Each structure stands twice: as C-alpha cells, then as structure tokens.
Give the backbone structure.
Amino acid sequence: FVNQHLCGSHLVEALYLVCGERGFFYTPKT
Amino acid sequence: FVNQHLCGSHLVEALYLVCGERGFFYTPKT
Amino acid sequence: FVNQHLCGSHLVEALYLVCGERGFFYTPKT
Amino acid sequence: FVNQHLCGSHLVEALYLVCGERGFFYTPKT
Amino acid sequence: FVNQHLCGSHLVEALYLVCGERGFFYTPKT
Amino acid sequence: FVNQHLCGSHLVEALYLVCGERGFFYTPKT
Amino acid sequence: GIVEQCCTSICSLYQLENYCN
Amino acid sequence: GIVEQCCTSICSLYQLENYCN
Amino acid sequence: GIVEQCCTSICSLYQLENYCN
Amino acid sequence: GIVEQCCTSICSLYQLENYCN
Amino acid sequence: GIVEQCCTSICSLYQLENYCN
Amino acid sequence: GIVEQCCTSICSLYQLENYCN
Ligand SMILES: [Cl-]
Ligand SMILES: [Cl-]
Ligand SMILES: [Zn+2]
Ligand SMILES: [Zn+2]
C-alpha cells in the first residue's frame, strides 16, 4: 500500500476503512 | 440540533464532529 | 460538545449535521 | 458533466463544489 | 484489513487511501 | 461554475462528481 | 424540490447551480 | 447499539456524545 | 461571517446553528 | 467490475489495490 | 499534472473533465 | 499517539490497524 498524511476527519475515515466491524478508537490526546 | 440518520462512514464523521479533541470509540455490533 | 476549525467542505458537512431538515445557508462572502 | 444521484450529505458536497465561493442554500422539503 | 461494502463516492475514497501517491483509475461499468 | 483549490481526497471526490459513469484517472505523479 | 429530486431520481450540475447564492 | 440505531432508525447528537472519550 | 467564525477562528456546534434556516 | 462488486457485494483492500497506477 | 493544475493552482469543473475517461 | 504518527508524521494502512479494537 502507501504512507500518507492523514488528519482530522480524513484520519477517522481511514480508521473506519481499515478497522470496519472490529471497531476502533480515535484518541488524539493520546 | 436535529435527529440523524447515519450509516457507514457517515456515523464516524458525525462522531468526529461531536467529540472533537476528546476523540471517541466506534463500536459496531459483531 | 467541542470547538474546532471547520473549513470548506468540512464546514458544510457540519452545517448539514447540525441543521439537517431545517436547511441552511453557506455564504462565505458573508 | 454527467447526471448525479445524490442523497444526504452527498448533495451538500456537490453544492459546495458547484457553487464555490458563491456559497449556496440547502433547502430540503419538510 | 476487513472486507468493504462501498458505493458511489465511498469507493473513490477507498481507492484514494489504498493507492496514495500511486494514484488509481476509476472505471465503472457502462 | 467556479474555480477553487481541490486537493487529495477532495480532488478525487470532485473527479467522481464531474466524470461519474465515464470513469476517470487520478495520477498525481503526472 | 432539488434535495428530493437528486436523491429519488437524478439531477444535473446545472440544476444544482440554481441553488448558488 | 448506537452504530445500528443511527442507521436502521435515527439518533441524536446527544446520544452520539456518549461515545466520546 | 461563517468562514471567519468557524474556519479562521473556532466555533461550537451551537454557533453553527446560527446558519440554519 | 470492481465498482459494481464493492457496492452489490463486498470487496477487499487487496482487490482495490489492483486499480492503483 | 492534475495536482499542479487543481490543488497547487486553481481549476474549474470544466478543467477537471480533462481527467475523465 | 495516532495524530503524531499519522497526521504530523506519515503512516501506513498497516500502522492504522494499531488503533482497531
Ligand atoms: Cl451513502
Ligand atoms: Cl484538508
Ligand atoms: Zn455516503
Ligand atoms: Zn479535507
């Protein structure tokens, strides 16, 4: 695949793509 | 605010807007 | 909720979320 | 340009692209 | 990675994430 | 219509809007 | 209206342009 | 759950806020 | 206007409701 | 094709990768 | 190419049709 | 965390799977 900058809503869209049914957490404070 | 009908990635977009820097967890059923 | 920077298509996506059936106007010239 | 089939937030995205800095009004039925 | 159910613009978003700087071709049937 | 900056996933969303069934290529390396 | 038309049938970019300010 | 509710029926922003960290 | 309030500066979801019809 | 497959059934990221340049 | 024309610079919807198949 | 790895820096789709449940 590739490596790119993924930020904000684009980052969570990518998490949704990659994780899907597994679910995910988005925790920017860390 | 109005009620929402949100499927797929659109739910994740809404969570992103609602939670902001707090972040969120996305946990679909099985 | 939270406060964040919302620009461009992200701003109108947020207006759609917040306003929905009410409708909205996006008038960047002011 | 081609004809469009646009629901929900996708209509707002199209309006955004079409109108640019002119902005637009989103006015759904009831 | 998980399997995907992708329609409309969501397919193009996935192709964008998958291909990155390589780019891609979008070729629907008729 | 208008002229604006279209980048990344926003650029491919615009290609999808404009091209639709014709299909398109996104080839950022050129 | 346009919102319903684009979703239940189809619409053109030219029809959309009518909703610009 | 919330994911299914928002899609099969409707949900509010206030219900969504419960999923924030 | 909205761009100044929400893009250049920072706004809440409540402030966004200012631009609803 | 891939466009129809991803929408009417399901598809993988690995199948999508075939459409990269 | 497209990135230079439409992202770095600025392009119209008509110019975007240059990249349709 | 994720913002540093994927936004500020650059990450792969494989690294994104680090944040799946
Ligand atoms: Cl959809
Ligand atoms: Cl952006
Ligand atoms: Zn969608
Ligand atoms: Zn963006």
In short: The longest strand of chain I covers residues 11-12. Strands of chain I lie at 11-12. Chains I and F do not touch (no CB pair under 8 Å).
